[PDB]
Amino acid sequence: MNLKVILYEKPHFLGHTKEFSEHIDSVPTFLKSDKDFHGIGSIRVIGGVWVAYEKEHFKGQQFLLEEGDFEDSSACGALSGPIMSFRYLQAN
């Protein structure tokens, strides 16, 4: 699988970005740099099938994110609040 997710600071793919191609157990640890942003305004899933979670370590309410462009909460319900971890999914 080609995995890639881009997180954007602001809705509609604006502001600074973060990129990943692996499980993110902790969004806070992932965004801990002073040159980063906090809170995710929009998401592009470039490759792979992912679960976004309310809490760290893949806990709390789950949202399914497949490949697509998610400009705001109307596009993706996950964006209507904090996302604290991401896990990619894998078939055999």
> What is the DSSP secondary-structure string of 17-70?
EEEESS-BS-HHHHT-STTS-SS--EEEEEES-EEEEEETTTEEEEEEE-SEEE
Strand order in the sheet with 14-20: 14-20, 4-10, 42-47, 68-70
Residue 83, C-beta contacts closer than 8 angstroms, at least 6 positions apart: 27, 40, 52, 53, 54, 63
How many Å apart are CA 46 and CA 32, to the nearest integer?
A: 23
Three-state SS for 78?
helix
Q: Tell me if 40 sits within 8 A of 28, measured CB to CB.
A: no
Q: Which residues pair with residue 19 across a beta bridge?
A: 6
Domain 1-92 belongs in CATH node 2.60.20.10: yes
Q: Tell me if 10 sits within 8 A of 4, measured CB to CB.
A: no
Resolution (in Å) of the shown entry?
1.9
DSSP state of 90: -
* Technique used: X-ray
CA angle 91, 21, 23 (to 5 degrees): 70
| Spans of all domains in the chain | 1-92
